[PDB]
Amino acid sequence: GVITLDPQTASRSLVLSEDRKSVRYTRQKKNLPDSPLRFDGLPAVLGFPGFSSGRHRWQVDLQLGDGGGCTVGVAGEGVRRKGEMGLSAEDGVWAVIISHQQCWASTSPGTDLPLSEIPRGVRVALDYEAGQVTLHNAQTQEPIFTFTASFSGKVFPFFAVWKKGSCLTLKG
């Protein structure tokens, strides 16, 4: 199922590609119009569509710039869009944060992940009725994390990326 990046949610710190399948961080903010839906404080963007039911999978390839990082997972539709405050599963973000030496799951408090290696891609699997979000290393199949939750209403693919040279690209 085709997932794309939703420009109407994208932080001004994010440049979506013309095909809306990739996104890079920009130090110079884009002139995106103000909206209550738009991330402002975190360099984040939702996917489209969101999901109310069923099993869904997608893959995110990632490149990090110097001192860079990204966040890959899922977010409840009610996720706060405004402020610089880090989001966690309390805020309805179930994601892994990847940086050059250190990856962590967005539990509350956060879980440091002792991975064989830093991923260069992440496979996300949502099972809405099972209340599970599973993350694997897309290339090696190393398990990264499994979140267990009870979902109500729509759950969206969630992405964030930061520092120059950092970028994400969606695959099937």
Author numbering: 294 to 465
Could you share sentences copied from the article?
The tripartite motif (TRIM) proteins form one of the largest subfamilies of RING-type E3 ubiquitin ligases, comprising more than 80 members. TRIM family members typically contain a RING domain usually catalyzing ubiquitin transfer; one or two B-box domains mediating protein–protein interactions; and a large coiled-coil domain region, which is involved in self-association or oligomerization with other TRIM E3-ligase proteins. About two-thirds of human TRIM proteins feature a PRYSPRY domain, also known as the B30.2 domain, in their C-terminal region. All characterized family members shared the same overall PRYSPRY twisted β-sandwich fold consisting of a 7-stranded and a 6-stranded antiparallel β-sheet.
In the TRIM15 crystal structure, a reasonably pronounced pocket was observed, with a solvent-accessible area of 83 Å2 and a solvent-accessible volume of 46 Å3. TRIM15 lacks the arginine at the center of the pocket seen in TRIM10, which is replaced by an isoleucine (Ile390), resulting in a substantially more hydrophobic pocket. There are two tryptophan side chains on opposite sides of the binding pocket (Trp397 and Trp455) that provide hydrophobic docking surfaces. Trp397 is conserved in TRIM10 but adopts a different conformation in TRIM15, pointing toward the center of the pocket rather than outward.
